[PDB]
Amino acid sequence: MMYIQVLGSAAGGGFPQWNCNCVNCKGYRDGTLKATARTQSSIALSDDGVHWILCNASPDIRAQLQAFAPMQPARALRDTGINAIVLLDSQIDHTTGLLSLREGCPHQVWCTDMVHQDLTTGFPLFNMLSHWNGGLQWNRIELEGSFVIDACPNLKFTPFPLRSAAPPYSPHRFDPHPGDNLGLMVEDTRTGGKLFYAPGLGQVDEKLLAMMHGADCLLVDGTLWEDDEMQRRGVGTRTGREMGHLAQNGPGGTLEVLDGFPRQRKVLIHINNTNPILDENSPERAEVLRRGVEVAFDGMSIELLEHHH
Amino acid sequence: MMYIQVLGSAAGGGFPQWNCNCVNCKGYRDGTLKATARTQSSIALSDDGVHWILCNASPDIRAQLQAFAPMQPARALRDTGINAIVLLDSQIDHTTGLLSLREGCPHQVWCTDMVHQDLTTGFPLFNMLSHWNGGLQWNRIELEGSFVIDACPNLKFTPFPLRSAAPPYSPHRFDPHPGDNLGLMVEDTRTGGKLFYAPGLGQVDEKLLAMMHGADCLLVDGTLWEDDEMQRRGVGTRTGREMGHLAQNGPGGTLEVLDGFPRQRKVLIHINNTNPILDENSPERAEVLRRGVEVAFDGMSIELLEHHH
Ligand SMILES: [Zn+2]
Ligand SMILES: [Zn+2]
Fold this sequence. Notes:
Two copies of one chain form a homodimer.
Chain A: E1 2-8, H1 23-30, E2 42-46, E3 52-55, H2 61-67, E4 82-86, H3 92-95, E5 107-112, H4 113-118, H5 125-129, E6 136-141, E7 155-161, E8 182-188, E9 194-198, H6 206-213, E10 217-221, H7 229-233, H8 254-258, E11 265-269, H9 283-290, E12 293-295, E13 301-304
Parallel strand pairs in A: 3-4, 4-5, 5-6, 9-10, 10-11, 11-12
Antiparallel strand pairs in A: 1-2, 1-13, 2-3, 7-8, 8-9
Bound molecules: zinc ion (ZN) (2 copies).
């Protein structure tokens, strides 16, 4: 059994977003819209329900941990359910939460060489936190092969490369490198149960589709309904493909992709505050549910029991 | 009229603290203790109720802004009630929140040269955020005199120096400098109403007491009940004076200091998760109330109407 806990299900900014008055955010604050607030994207993984691996450390991490009881097992005066953190990239929204964990150092942190470079230079979290009881202990994610975190010995992690898009602060934003961005396959080696985790997905190739077919649960980018959603709502000028996100709708959209995966569990995560699927009364949400696709929400629990083969 | 809004009232770590199972934190999670959760120390100031100055940008800033409606005036598709941010020091718990505001740059940020040095080097927030639409625009706080922020033209800020204690990450933690730490006097120049704000206060001298007597409201360090509170609760080894905090109780304690200020409004803020005054049923809380002192809570509103003279 692999336990997957959705700590946060929104895109950057969360929902509602602090400075946003789009139809969704204003509607939420007004009480006129049936939607649930969401913190920024982050999941926790476990093979036993006691030892957890945090995937991405969001700026909302304090509220996220507090809302999920296994994060505080209370086995000692000081304690936490977090046994390791895996970073998929070096973006502020995926790393800032580490600052809020510094009272609990040392932490085992898994990330690529490229992300470690960013987090020792442009956003020098490793350097900063080294002054808190040894700080973050770097475990290198290699760009081929798999890894296993000791605390959850039955979870086998196999990262896969995504198009490189270093964050704006990065010394190499204008010079992208392999290892800037990855997605995760996670296997419970006791059952063969497999999670495909790609909260940021801007393109799909044949090899990607192949590896998805071997998965049991697909947890994938749900940022925008349409590629021009930001402009439609009047709160941004950047497009979906510009931000490295495939929209749900349209030719080559994620809903079209997911049509080829009837037997997988399918869940959208990393949902932007502008996305109508957040409206529980929207025809867009209705269409997602009609396609057998789920919309992640904070506190969602996914249990992977077994492999389909 | 000066509006003071307590966005967060806890010390670093907040209450409950994510990795803490002390009597208070465990009691809160158990439902067996009558206490209210608190986010990390931060206040907002206004002279008109519409334009706000944030004092310290805490890691809890998203939840803090969301809980206080004037922070979203909704005058445009993009909007915020934050017109400026004042930093009193460069500590992670007082600055991290800026990362969560980057979608709203440019921001006017007031801080000393020493804090600006830290935030361009060891924790390079200014450098990072410069890539978000101009980033943070530095306004230097000088080490003498006053300043006025344009958006609230009736608030006159006069900082006062505190003992220098640069954060652990700082290139000069072992070499403290004037300007590392300050407190604030804030005057409504329409009424002469004055706030004395010292959320971190480790010592008091004659000049400090003098300037306090000229204030109408004293909003001061409430971190620990006793100097050895951390050890008593079993969750730390550092002492109150070691962390630059005068405890409420004992010779030279803040309660003893506050005895000399009968006519000022007196409010404790920046309260540690270990502090028994958080227990609404504690005899420690009872003693505070008996002394005419208040315990800040998230969402507390303080209105300064006029000067006592
Ligand atoms: Zn919005
Ligand atoms: Zn505690």
